[PDB]
From a paper:
TvCyP1 is a cyclophilin present in the parasite Trichomonas vaginalis (T. vaginalis) showing high sequence identity to HcypA. However, for Myb1, the nuclear translocation is regulated by TvCyP1. The interaction of TvCyP1 with Myb1 leads to the cytoplasmic release of Myb1 from membrane-bound vesicles, an important step preceding translocation to nucleus. By and large, our study reports for the first time the structure of a catalytically active dimeric cyclophilin possessing only a single cyclophilin domain and provides structural details of its interaction with an intriguing biological substrate.
Residue numbers in the entry:
A (entry chain A): 2 to 173
B (entry chain C): -1 to 173
C (entry chain D): 1 to 5
D (entry chain B): 2 to 7
The structure:
Amino acid sequence: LKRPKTFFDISIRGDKVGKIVFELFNDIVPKTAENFRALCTGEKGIGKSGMPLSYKGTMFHRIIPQFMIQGGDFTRFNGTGGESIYGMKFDDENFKVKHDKPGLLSMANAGPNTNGSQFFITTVETPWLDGHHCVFGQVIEGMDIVKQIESCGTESGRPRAMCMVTDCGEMK
Amino acid sequence: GSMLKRPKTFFDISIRGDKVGKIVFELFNDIVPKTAENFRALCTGEKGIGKSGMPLSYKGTMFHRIIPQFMIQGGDFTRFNGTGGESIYGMKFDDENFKVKHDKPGLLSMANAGPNTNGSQFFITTVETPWLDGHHCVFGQVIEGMDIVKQIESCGTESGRPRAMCMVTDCGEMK
Amino acid sequence: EYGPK
Amino acid sequence: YGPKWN
């Protein structure tokens, strides 16, 4: 099977800056790749939170230069929420893929088997994250836009400008 | 003599990433010139960089607190969550007067944390809120795009927590 | 909490 | 919540 491809449309400080396109490692982590894929299309509908299972209109709420950019919180928009297509949380699937390069897409979590909808995109190699966060895809287009989002962050993770996924979906 | 007409400013609004249109305000420079000027200048961004280190501008800000059948609140361009913002006069400035009453929907009014703590945050009423008279300085009114105000209001909750991201994507003065 | 109540 | 910096 092909690796699924998805996209974020991105605006920064209210300005359209282009598209990020991901490819998802459904050959390595099919449950984790599927969660992100279906959250890009919104096809599952309304979650246990009462809000759409969709990344549309979410923010990169935690941005740390020379580390990663993190988003996916579509229930509280601030990093305190989110929900997967499997429930509030789902298990770590495997750790086959290493955080050994920029542009990797990986699951944010609060410890083992606590994946939800939050994800991060690395901007450096992050080997200390290996074995703790499931890497499930990578940026194939728009790494510069990832850098433009990164440039709005701080050491504490607080954004200095609103970077938004204005639309998203699957490329098929 | 002097006969300066009321300034008009605008927000371009997106909701959940979708362009929905423009809100236009007229500002009561004839009644509250200092408060009116602060908002006008935060629409154009002409003052440059603030003491926060961030642009003195509403561009890219959110409506971070939305309460249906009450008001929609925005203007925090330093922390984007209601804890920040600053005025063109410093971190805060005094209540100018309370001459204009919260007696109809679509009034522009200063958010504060008590007396003489006006910064950059503002709200737009969607109902009469006369119990805010004497505590929040009304300085303008919506003259176009009240329907966009209601679309923002529709993303609200009782707590004010937003259910969708409503952004001022662009803003300025119409001169 | 900031803003009108 | 999310990845920690080490």
